Amino acid sequence: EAEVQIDRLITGRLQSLQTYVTQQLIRAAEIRASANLAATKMSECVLGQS
Amino acid sequence: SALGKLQDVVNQNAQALNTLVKQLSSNFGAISSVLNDILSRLDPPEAEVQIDRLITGRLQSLQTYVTQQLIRAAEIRASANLAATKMSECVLGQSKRVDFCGKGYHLMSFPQSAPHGVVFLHVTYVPAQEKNFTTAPAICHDGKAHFPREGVFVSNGTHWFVTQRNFYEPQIITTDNTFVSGNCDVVIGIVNN
Amino acid sequence: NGLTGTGVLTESNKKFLPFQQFGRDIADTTDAVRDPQTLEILDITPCSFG
Amino acid sequence: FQTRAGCLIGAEHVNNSYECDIPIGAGICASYQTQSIIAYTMSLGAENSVAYSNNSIAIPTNFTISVTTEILPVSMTKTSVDCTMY
Amino acid sequence: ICGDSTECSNLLLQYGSFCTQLNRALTGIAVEQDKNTQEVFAQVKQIYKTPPIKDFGGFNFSQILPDPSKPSKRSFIEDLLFNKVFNGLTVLPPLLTDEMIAQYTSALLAGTITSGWTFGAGAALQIPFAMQMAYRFNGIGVTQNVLYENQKLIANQFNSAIGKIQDSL
Ligand SMILES: *[C@@H]1O[C@H](CO)[C@@H](O[C@@H]2O[C@H](CO)[C@@H](O)[C@H](O)[C@H]2NC(C)=O)[C@H](O)[C@H]1NC(C)=O
Ligand SMILES: *[C@@H]1O[C@H](CO)[C@@H](O[C@@H]2O[C@H](CO)[C@@H](O)[C@H](O)[C@H]2NC(C)=O)[C@H](O)[C@H]1NC(C)=O
Ligand SMILES: *[C@@H]1O[C@H](CO)[C@@H](O[C@@H]2O[C@H](CO)[C@@H](O)[C@H](O)[C@H]2NC(C)=O)[C@H](O)[C@H]1NC(C)=O
Ligand SMILES: *[C@@H]1O[C@H](CO)[C@@H](O[C@@H]2O[C@H](CO)[C@@H](O)[C@H](O)[C@H]2NC(C)=O)[C@H](O)[C@H]1NC(C)=O
Ligand SMILES: *[C@@H]1O[C@H](CO)[C@@H](O[C@@H]2O[C@H](CO)[C@@H](O)[C@H](O)[C@H]2NC(C)=O)[C@H](O)[C@H]1NC(C)=O
Ligand SMILES: *[C@@H]1O[C@H](CO)[C@@H](O[C@@H]2O[C@H](CO)[C@@H](O)[C@H](O)[C@H]2NC(C)=O)[C@H](O)[C@H]1NC(C)=O
Ligand SMILES: *[C@@H]1O[C@H](CO)[C@@H](O)[C@H](O)[C@H]1NC(C)=O
C-alpha cells in the first residue's frame, strides 16, 4: 500500500524539479545575451571610440 | 591540417536523440516495457491500466525533448544572425568597430563554408617596432601657435618633425602641414621652433 | 517525541519560550529542538554531503 | 589540500602561477607537470608598466599583416518525430 | 526526491534517465556562467600598471583607480557598488574571484589612461593624456585647438562630473 502513496509523491517532486530546470534554461539564455552585449561594449567603448 | 564550436552542436543533438530513444525501455511502473507483451497476456480491462502508464511516461519524455530543442534552436538563431551581420560588415565592407572583425585594424575578410557553419578569415594590420620620441602639443613661431593638420610633432632629440600617427615618416614642419590658432601663451606645453 | 530526522546535534545559543518545543527556519525546516528531559535546546545540522 | 571549492586529494600545491589548465574553482586550477598532478592559483598575465610621461610618445616603425579565423554555427539537423508512432 | 530512503530510490529507477538529463542541463548552464565572465573581462593580455607620479593634464582619476588600503584592492566606486547589492542543493563558486575581476578592470583602466586605444590593437604605446583627449576631439569633428585652449575648463568639468556619480550612488 505504500508503493501507491510513494509514487504520488515521486510524480509531483519530479514535476517540480523539472519545472525548476526549464525556467533556469530560459533565464540563463537571457543573462547570456546581456553578457554578450557587455562584451561588445567593452570592445567598442572602452578599447575604442564609437 | 579548432572546430569544437561546431562539434558541440552535433554532439548535443545526438546526445538528446539517444536519450529519447533509450527512454522507450522504461516501465514507468508497468509490468513490461514492451506494449505487445501487455497486449498478448492481458485482456482489455487490465491491459488499459498498464498501457496508460506507458503513455504517460512516453508523452513526458517527448515533451522534454521538444522543449529542449526549442531552447537550443533559439541559440542557433542568435549565432546565425551574428554571422549574417559579420558577412555584411566584414566581407562586403571595411569595419571600424573594434574587435568585430579580428584583433587589429580590419583590412578585409574572406568567407569559407563549413559543415554546419562558416569560417571567416580576417586580415588585419598590426603595428610593430615602436620607438620613443619627445612630443609637443603646438609649435610657437612669430608669436603664433601652430597645430598639425594630421599627425604629431615629434623630436629625435635635436630636430622637430611632423609624422602621421600610425607609421613613422618624419617631415619638415611647414605652413602646409600646420594651421594657426592664437598666441603661444595659452596652451600648456608649447615649444619654440 | 515524534520529531523524526537525521543529522548532527550540537548545543546552541537560542532561547525558546517556555511553551515552545522546537524551532524552524525560513523554508520551514527544523533547525533546533528541545529535548524533553534536560530542558535544553539543541541545534540540528544536516550530516555532510557533496 | 583544502580549497574553497572543497577538499582535494592526490594533487600537490605548488607556489607558482600558470595559465589555467583544468578549472577547480575559486581561483584554483590543476595541471599535469613534471610526472605528477599540481594545483595552483591561476595567473592573469604578465605584468607591464607603460613608460608614461607628459612629453613622451611611442610611434611604430613597421607593421605585420595578420590573418586569423573565426568559426560560427549557422544551422542544425532537421529532425521530425511522429508522436503517435513513438 | 527520496532523501536517502531505499524504498523510494528503487521505485525511482522505473523512470529511466530523467535525473541524468536534469543534471546535464544544470551543468551546462553552470559552465557558461564562467564563460560569460571570461569574455567580458579577459580582454587584455598584459596586466598594465599605472605610473606612480600621476599627472594627466589636470584630470583626476583617483575615485576609480585601485585603492590599496581598501578590501580586495578595489577602487572607491567599486566599493559603493559592492555595498549596495540543504537537501541535495548546492552552490558552486565562480572560477574567477572578485579580486581577480578587480585586477582585470584595473588593467583595462590603466591601459586606457596611458595608451589610449593602442593597446586593444597591439602593443601599448604611451601618449600624454591631453594629446589623447585632442585625438578624441578630432574623432567627433572638433579641432584640437578647442581642447588645448580650454584644457583647464574641460578638466574641471570632468572632475566635477566624476564627483557626482559618487554622490548619486
Ligand atoms: C622608452 O623609454 C622608456 C624609459 O626610458 C623605456 O622604459 C624602460 O623599460 C624597461 C622595462 O624593461 C625598464 O627596465 C627601464 O628602466 C625603462 N627605462 C629606460 C630603459 O630608460 C622604454 O623601453 C622605451 N621604449 C622603447 C620602445 O624603446
Ligand atoms: C635628428 O635628425 C636630423 C635630421 O634628420 C639629424 O640631422 C642631420 O644628421 C645628418 C647625419 O648624417 C647630417 O648629415 C645632417 O647634416 C643633419 N642635419 C640636417 C639634415 O639638417 C640629426 O642628427 C638627428 N639627431 C639625432 C640625435 O639623431
Ligand atoms: C611634465 O612633467 C615634467 C616632469 O614631471 C615637468 O617638468 C617640471 O616642470 C616644473 C615647472 O615647469 C619644474 O618646476 C620641475 O622641476 C620640472 N621637473 C623636472 C624633473 O625637471 C613639466 O613641466 C611637465 N609639463 C609639460 C612638459 O608640459
Ligand atoms: C621662446 O622664445 C620667446 C621669444 O620669441 C621667449 O619669450 C621671451 O620670454 C622672456 C621670459 O619669459 C621674456 O622676458 C621676453 O619678453 C619674451 N620675449 C618675447 C619676444 O616674447 C620665450 O621665453 C622662449 N621660451 C623658450 C622655452 O625657449
Ligand atoms: C528528570 O528527572 C531527572 C532525574 O530522574 C532530573 O535530573 C536531575 O536534574 C537536576 C537539575 O535540575 C540535577 O541537579 C540532578 O542532579 C538530576 N538528578 C538526576 C538523578 O539526574 C531532571 O531534572 C528531570 N527533569 C524534568 C524536566 O523533570
Ligand atoms: C583628486 O580628487 C580627490 C577628491 O576625491 C582629492 O583627494 C581628496 O582631497 C581632499 C581635499 O584636499 C582631502 O581632504 C582628501 O583627504 C583627499 N583624499 C581622499 C578623499 O581620499 C585629490 O587630492 C585629487 N587629486 C589631485 C591631484 O588634486
Ligand atoms: C609557498 O610560499 C609561501 C610564502 O609565504 C610559504 O610560506 C610556503 O611554505 C610555500 N609553500 C611551498 C610548498 O613552497
mmCIF file of N, CA and C in Angstrom, chain E residues 16-90:
data_model
loop_
_atom_site.group_PDB
_atom_site.id
_atom_site.type_symbol
_atom_site.label_atom_id
_atom_site.label_comp_id
_atom_site.label_asym_id
_atom_site.label_seq_id
_atom_site.Cartn_x
_atom_site.Cartn_y
_atom_site.Cartn_z
ATOM 1 N N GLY E 16 13.597 5.805 -15.613
ATOM 2 C CA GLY E 16 14.559 5.873 -16.701
ATOM 3 C C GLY E 16 15.733 6.765 -16.349
ATOM 4 N N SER E 17 15.945 7.798 -17.151
ATOM 5 C CA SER E 17 17.123 8.639 -17.033
ATOM 6 C C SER E 17 16.770 10.113 -16.922
ATOM 7 N N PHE E 18 15.603 10.438 -16.366
ATOM 8 C CA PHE E 18 15.226 11.842 -16.242
ATOM 9 C C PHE E 18 16.225 12.615 -15.395
ATOM 10 N N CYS E 19 16.807 11.958 -14.409
ATOM 11 C CA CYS E 19 17.643 12.657 -13.459
ATOM 12 C C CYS E 19 19.096 12.733 -13.887
ATOM 13 N N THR E 20 19.464 12.084 -14.978
ATOM 14 C CA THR E 20 20.749 12.361 -15.590
ATOM 15 C C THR E 20 20.637 13.529 -16.556
ATOM 16 N N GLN E 21 19.486 13.661 -17.213
ATOM 17 C CA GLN E 21 19.217 14.823 -18.040
ATOM 18 C C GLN E 21 19.167 16.103 -17.233
ATOM 19 N N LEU E 22 18.475 16.095 -16.095
ATOM 20 C CA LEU E 22 18.411 17.322 -15.310
ATOM 21 C C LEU E 22 19.790 17.797 -14.876
ATOM 22 N N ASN E 23 20.645 16.883 -14.438
ATOM 23 C CA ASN E 23 21.995 17.246 -14.055
ATOM 24 C C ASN E 23 22.826 17.714 -15.227
ATOM 25 N N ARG E 24 22.680 17.086 -16.390
ATOM 26 C CA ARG E 24 23.378 17.566 -17.569
ATOM 27 C C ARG E 24 22.991 19.000 -17.892
ATOM 28 N N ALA E 25 21.703 19.320 -17.786
ATOM 29 C CA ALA E 25 21.256 20.676 -18.075
ATOM 30 C C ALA E 25 21.842 21.681 -17.096
ATOM 31 N N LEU E 26 21.790 21.375 -15.806
ATOM 32 C CA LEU E 26 22.326 22.310 -14.831
ATOM 33 C C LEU E 26 23.836 22.469 -14.935
ATOM 34 N N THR E 27 24.559 21.419 -15.306
ATOM 35 C CA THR E 27 25.995 21.546 -15.505
ATOM 36 C C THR E 27 26.322 22.390 -16.723
ATOM 37 N N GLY E 28 25.576 22.199 -17.806
ATOM 38 C CA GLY E 28 25.752 23.023 -18.974
ATOM 39 C C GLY E 28 25.492 24.485 -18.733
ATOM 40 N N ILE E 29 24.561 24.831 -17.839
ATOM 41 C CA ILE E 29 24.388 26.252 -17.546
ATOM 42 C C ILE E 29 25.316 26.760 -16.457
ATOM 43 N N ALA E 30 25.926 25.890 -15.662
ATOM 44 C CA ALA E 30 26.919 26.391 -14.719
ATOM 45 C C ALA E 30 28.289 26.594 -15.348
ATOM 46 N N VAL E 31 28.586 25.933 -16.460
ATOM 47 C CA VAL E 31 29.856 26.190 -17.137
ATOM 48 C C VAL E 31 29.810 27.498 -17.937
ATOM 49 N N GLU E 32 28.679 27.796 -18.552
ATOM 50 C CA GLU E 32 28.590 29.016 -19.322
ATOM 51 C C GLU E 32 28.535 30.266 -18.461
ATOM 52 N N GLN E 33 28.316 30.163 -17.153
ATOM 53 C CA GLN E 33 28.408 31.356 -16.323
ATOM 54 C C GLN E 33 29.835 31.833 -16.178
ATOM 55 N N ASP E 34 30.794 30.925 -16.140
ATOM 56 C CA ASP E 34 32.194 31.298 -16.159
ATOM 57 C C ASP E 34 32.658 31.699 -17.540
ATOM 58 N N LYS E 35 32.109 31.071 -18.575
ATOM 59 C CA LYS E 35 32.389 31.572 -19.914
ATOM 60 C C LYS E 35 31.875 32.996 -20.122
ATOM 61 N N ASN E 36 30.759 33.363 -19.497
ATOM 62 C CA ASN E 36 30.233 34.718 -19.630
ATOM 63 C C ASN E 36 31.201 35.753 -19.082
ATOM 64 N N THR E 37 31.779 35.499 -17.906
ATOM 65 C CA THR E 37 32.690 36.449 -17.281
ATOM 66 C C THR E 37 34.014 36.525 -18.013
ATOM 67 N N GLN E 38 34.504 35.386 -18.492
ATOM 68 C CA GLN E 38 35.788 35.383 -19.169
ATOM 69 C C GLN E 38 35.784 36.269 -20.404
ATOM 70 N N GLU E 39 34.668 36.371 -21.105
ATOM 71 C CA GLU E 39 34.645 37.131 -22.342
ATOM 72 C C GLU E 39 34.334 38.605 -22.150
ATOM 73 N N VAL E 40 33.868 39.016 -20.978
ATOM 74 C CA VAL E 40 33.734 40.436 -20.703
ATOM 75 C C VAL E 40 35.032 40.992 -20.143
ATOM 76 N N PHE E 41 35.722 40.232 -19.303
ATOM 77 C CA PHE E 41 36.793 40.863 -18.544
ATOM 78 C C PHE E 41 38.196 40.519 -19.014
ATOM 79 N N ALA E 42 38.432 39.336 -19.559
ATOM 80 C CA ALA E 42 39.770 38.976 -20.020
ATOM 81 C C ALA E 42 39.946 39.494 -21.440
ATOM 82 N N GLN E 43 39.972 40.815 -21.572
ATOM 83 C CA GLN E 43 40.162 41.479 -22.853
ATOM 84 C C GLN E 43 41.531 42.138 -22.916
ATOM 85 N N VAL E 44 42.467 41.654 -22.113
ATOM 86 C CA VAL E 44 43.840 42.130 -22.094
ATOM 87 C C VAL E 44 44.742 40.912 -22.053
ATOM 88 N N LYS E 45 45.939 41.075 -22.597
ATOM 89 C CA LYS E 45 46.992 40.086 -22.433
ATOM 90 C C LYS E 45 47.898 40.415 -21.254
ATOM 91 N N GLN E 46 48.344 41.657 -21.155
ATOM 92 C CA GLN E 46 49.171 42.106 -20.051
ATOM 93 C C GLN E 46 48.310 42.697 -18.948
ATOM 94 N N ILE E 47 48.846 42.678 -17.742
ATOM 95 C CA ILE E 47 48.271 43.417 -16.634
ATOM 96 C C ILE E 47 49.037 44.723 -16.545
ATOM 97 N N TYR E 48 48.429 45.802 -17.007
ATOM 98 C CA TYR E 48 49.094 47.085 -17.027
ATOM 99 C C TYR E 48 48.942 47.772 -15.687
ATOM 100 N N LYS E 49 49.998 48.460 -15.281
ATOM 101 C CA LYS E 49 50.003 49.248 -14.066
ATOM 102 C C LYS E 49 50.179 50.713 -14.418
ATOM 103 N N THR E 50 49.636 51.569 -13.587
ATOM 104 C CA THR E 50 49.717 52.996 -13.824
ATOM 105 C C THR E 50 50.979 53.567 -13.173
ATOM 106 N N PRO E 51 51.465 54.719 -13.632
ATOM 107 C CA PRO E 51 52.721 55.236 -13.102
ATOM 108 C C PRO E 51 52.543 55.768 -11.695
ATOM 109 N N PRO E 52 53.616 55.793 -10.904
ATOM 110 C CA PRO E 52 53.488 56.319 -9.535
ATOM 111 C C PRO E 52 53.165 57.800 -9.477
ATOM 112 N N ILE E 53 53.818 58.633 -10.281
ATOM 113 C CA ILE E 53 53.521 60.061 -10.325
ATOM 114 C C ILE E 53 52.497 60.306 -11.429
ATOM 115 N N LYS E 54 51.316 60.767 -11.032
ATOM 116 C CA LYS E 54 50.123 60.760 -11.874
ATOM 117 C C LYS E 54 49.741 62.189 -12.243
ATOM 118 N N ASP E 55 50.305 62.691 -13.334
ATOM 119 C CA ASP E 55 49.910 63.999 -13.841
ATOM 120 C C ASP E 55 49.322 63.814 -15.232
ATOM 121 N N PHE E 56 47.999 63.839 -15.306
ATOM 122 C CA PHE E 56 47.268 63.560 -16.527
ATOM 123 C C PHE E 56 46.633 64.817 -17.103
ATOM 124 N N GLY E 57 47.304 65.953 -16.961
ATOM 125 C CA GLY E 57 46.853 67.190 -17.556
ATOM 126 C C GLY E 57 45.768 67.921 -16.805
ATOM 127 N N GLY E 58 45.589 67.638 -15.526
ATOM 128 C CA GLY E 58 44.521 68.217 -14.752
ATOM 129 C C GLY E 58 43.375 67.280 -14.480
ATOM 130 N N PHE E 59 43.297 66.172 -15.199
ATOM 131 C CA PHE E 59 42.277 65.169 -14.976
ATOM 132 C C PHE E 59 42.658 64.320 -13.776
ATOM 133 N N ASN E 60 41.658 63.928 -13.003
ATOM 134 C CA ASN E 60 41.851 63.292 -11.710
ATOM 135 C C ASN E 60 41.041 62.009 -11.701
ATOM 136 N N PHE E 61 41.723 60.867 -11.678
ATOM 137 C CA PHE E 61 41.071 59.567 -11.740
ATOM 138 C C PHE E 61 41.121 58.831 -10.409
ATOM 139 N N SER E 62 41.206 59.551 -9.298
ATOM 140 C CA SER E 62 41.534 58.899 -8.038
ATOM 141 C C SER E 62 40.381 58.099 -7.453
ATOM 142 N N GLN E 63 39.140 58.414 -7.801
ATOM 143 C CA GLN E 63 37.993 57.670 -7.304
ATOM 144 C C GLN E 63 37.690 56.418 -8.109
ATOM 145 N N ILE E 64 38.404 56.162 -9.202
ATOM 146 C CA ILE E 64 38.208 54.952 -9.985
ATOM 147 C C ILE E 64 39.484 54.154 -10.149
ATOM 148 N N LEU E 65 40.503 54.560 -9.607
ATOM 149 C CA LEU E 65 41.725 53.781 -9.616
ATOM 150 C C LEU E 65 41.824 52.950 -8.344
ATOM 151 N N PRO E 66 42.523 51.818 -8.373
ATOM 152 C CA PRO E 66 42.536 50.935 -7.206
ATOM 153 C C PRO E 66 43.104 51.608 -5.968
ATOM 154 N N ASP E 67 42.606 51.167 -4.821
ATOM 155 C CA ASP E 67 42.963 51.713 -3.522
ATOM 156 C C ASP E 67 43.560 50.610 -2.659
ATOM 157 N N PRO E 68 44.836 50.693 -2.283
ATOM 158 C CA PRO E 68 45.459 49.565 -1.569
ATOM 159 C C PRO E 68 44.914 49.349 -0.166
ATOM 160 N N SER E 69 44.557 50.414 0.544
ATOM 161 C CA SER E 69 44.031 50.300 1.895
ATOM 162 C C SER E 69 42.589 49.812 1.948
ATOM 163 N N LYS E 70 41.993 49.457 0.814
ATOM 164 C CA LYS E 70 40.599 49.035 0.747
ATOM 165 C C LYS E 70 40.509 47.516 0.679
ATOM 166 N N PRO E 71 39.289 46.944 0.802
ATOM 167 C CA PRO E 71 39.153 45.485 0.674
ATOM 168 C C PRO E 71 39.230 45.010 -0.767
ATOM 169 N N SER E 72 40.065 44.003 -1.013
ATOM 170 C CA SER E 72 40.318 43.373 -2.301
ATOM 171 C C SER E 72 41.007 44.312 -3.280
ATOM 172 N N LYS E 73 41.579 45.427 -2.822
ATOM 173 C CA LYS E 73 42.260 46.388 -3.688
ATOM 174 C C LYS E 73 41.308 46.975 -4.722
ATOM 175 N N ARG E 74 40.093 47.285 -4.301
ATOM 176 C CA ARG E 74 39.103 47.874 -5.178
ATOM 177 C C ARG E 74 39.248 49.382 -5.217
ATOM 178 N N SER E 75 38.647 49.978 -6.231
ATOM 179 C CA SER E 75 38.534 51.416 -6.312
ATOM 180 C C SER E 75 37.473 51.911 -5.335
ATOM 181 N N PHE E 76 37.432 53.224 -5.151
ATOM 182 C CA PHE E 76 36.478 53.807 -4.221
ATOM 183 C C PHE E 76 35.046 53.618 -4.701
ATOM 184 N N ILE E 77 34.826 53.628 -6.012
ATOM 185 C CA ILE E 77 33.473 53.486 -6.535
ATOM 186 C C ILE E 77 33.098 52.017 -6.680
ATOM 187 N N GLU E 78 34.075 51.130 -6.807
ATOM 188 C CA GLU E 78 33.778 49.708 -6.796
ATOM 189 C C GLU E 78 33.328 49.222 -5.429
ATOM 190 N N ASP E 79 33.631 49.965 -4.367
ATOM 191 C CA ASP E 79 33.149 49.637 -3.034
ATOM 192 C C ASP E 79 31.701 50.031 -2.825
ATOM 193 N N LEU E 80 31.325 51.253 -3.193
ATOM 194 C CA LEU E 80 29.930 51.646 -3.097
ATOM 195 C C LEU E 80 29.021 50.676 -3.825
ATOM 196 N N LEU E 81 29.521 50.022 -4.866
ATOM 197 C CA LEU E 81 28.715 49.071 -5.609
ATOM 198 C C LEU E 81 28.591 47.741 -4.892
ATOM 199 N N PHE E 82 29.645 47.276 -4.233
ATOM 200 C CA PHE E 82 29.568 46.021 -3.507
ATOM 201 C C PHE E 82 28.872 46.158 -2.167
ATOM 202 N N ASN E 83 28.573 47.372 -1.738
ATOM 203 C CA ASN E 83 27.802 47.590 -0.531
ATOM 204 C C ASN E 83 26.327 47.797 -0.807
ATOM 205 N N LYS E 84 25.952 48.131 -2.032
ATOM 206 C CA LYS E 84 24.559 48.431 -2.311
ATOM 207 C C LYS E 84 23.791 47.176 -2.701
ATOM 208 N N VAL E 85 24.445 46.240 -3.374
ATOM 209 C CA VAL E 85 23.809 44.978 -3.726
ATOM 210 C C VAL E 85 24.619 43.801 -3.214
ATOM 211 N N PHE E 86 21.023 22.275 1.347
ATOM 212 C CA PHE E 86 20.118 21.941 2.430
ATOM 213 C C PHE E 86 19.580 20.529 2.285
ATOM 214 N N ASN E 87 19.051 20.189 1.112
ATOM 215 C CA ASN E 87 18.759 18.790 0.825
ATOM 216 C C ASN E 87 18.938 18.486 -0.653
ATOM 217 N N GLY E 88 20.155 18.127 -1.031
ATOM 218 C CA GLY E 88 20.505 17.916 -2.412
ATOM 219 C C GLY E 88 20.758 19.167 -3.216
ATOM 220 N N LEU E 89 20.806 20.334 -2.588
ATOM 221 C CA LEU E 89 21.003 21.603 -3.270
ATOM 222 C C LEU E 89 22.340 22.190 -2.859
ATOM 223 N N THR E 90 23.175 22.526 -3.832
ATOM 224 C CA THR E 90 24.450 23.158 -3.543
ATOM 225 C C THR E 90 24.697 24.324 -4.487
#
